[PDB]
């Protein structure tokens, strides 16, 4: 009743990872193109990441949203675990941002609406992402944002969290300060993301990790002159020191700047 590697035509590698590679593949029965992430069982075990991987799969395999990369199913053989994933034709968002330097307002606003919608879907299920940044996002056929990696994600039904996690430039003050945190950390990262989209560099960029931490906890935000008042309004509302004061995800979707600039299109559904 289940999949094996012989059920697919391997097309070519898409990603080079350090636990295995990702390949563009075609499922034979349906000639459906997808991505196959291949992980080696002994390397995962030696590195002690079995439970981590289990948790990532459990979370991603139960999320169904147009702006979250789908994990259709998975299977394994003697030496490998195979994850059947949605193929994001336009690739890595960080490569696109690097190529353009910075995104215009339409592009940025569209990504923000998609991000907020996907994050809202996660939070409604008590899943906190905790590592939103360009590198963890892929792009669909029409350029739609796809949250692709859930490496730091957690299902947190009750208990606030204590783990520091994420990425330096995106860490919220509460994590730096050793406080407990909750889903509002994703609101903060969404604000850093919006700024980096429009500016091309994260807001608290500094020569040293202690200077970056200092800028974050003081919320030392300095907006470049070219940013529009609307974009600064949204960023400022997300990058609040106090978690409870951060603009809610529904507030991001309803923000006038997002409404005025986003050109979001929902992909066709079966």
């Amino acid at each position: 009743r289940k999949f094996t590697i012989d059920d697919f035509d391997i097309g070519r590698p898409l990603g080079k990872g350090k636990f295995g590679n990702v390949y563009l593949a075609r499922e034979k029965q349906n000639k459906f193109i997808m991505a196959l992430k291949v992980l080696f069982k002994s390397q995962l075990e030696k590195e002690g990441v079995e439970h981590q991987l289990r948790r990532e799969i459990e979370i991603q395999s139960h999320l169904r949203h147009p702006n979250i990369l789908r994990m259709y199913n998975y299977f394994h053989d003697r030496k490998r675990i195979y994850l059947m994933l949605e193929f994001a034709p336009r690739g890595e968002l960080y490569k696109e941002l690097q190529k353009h330097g910075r995104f215009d307002e339409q592009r940025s606003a569209t990504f923000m609406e998609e991000l907020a919608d996907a994050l809202h879907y996660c939070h409604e299920r008590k899943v906190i992402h905790r590592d939103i940044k360009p590198e963890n996002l892929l792009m669909g056929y029409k350029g739609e944002l796809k949250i692709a990696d859930f490496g730091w994600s957690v299902h947190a039904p009750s208990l606030r969290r204590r783990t520091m996690c994420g990425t330096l430039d995106y860490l919220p003050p509460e994590m730096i300060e050793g406080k407990t945190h909750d889903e509002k950390v994703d609101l903060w990262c969404a604000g850093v993301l919006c700024y980096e989209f429009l500016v091309g560099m994260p807001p608290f960029d500094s020569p040293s990790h202690t200077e970056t931490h200092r800028r974050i906890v003081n919320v030392d935000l300095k907006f470049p002159p070219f940013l529009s008042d609307g974009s600064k309004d949204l960023i400022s509302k997300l990058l609040r020191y106090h978690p409870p004061q951060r603009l809610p995800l529904k507030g991001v979707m309803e923000h006038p700047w997002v409404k005025a600039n986003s050109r979001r299109v929902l992909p066709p559904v079966y």
Partner: protein, 43 residues
Amino acid sequence: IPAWASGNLLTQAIRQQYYKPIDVDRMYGTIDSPKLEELFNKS
């Protein structure tokens, strides 16, 4: 690299898939999955 996985044959296929999505929830979300507990054990 197989023909289907590059250039125009691939682009056309990708476009076709976007506009004519298959019922993945049934086509793949109906197929058995190994228990996550079993992933690192005998296949």
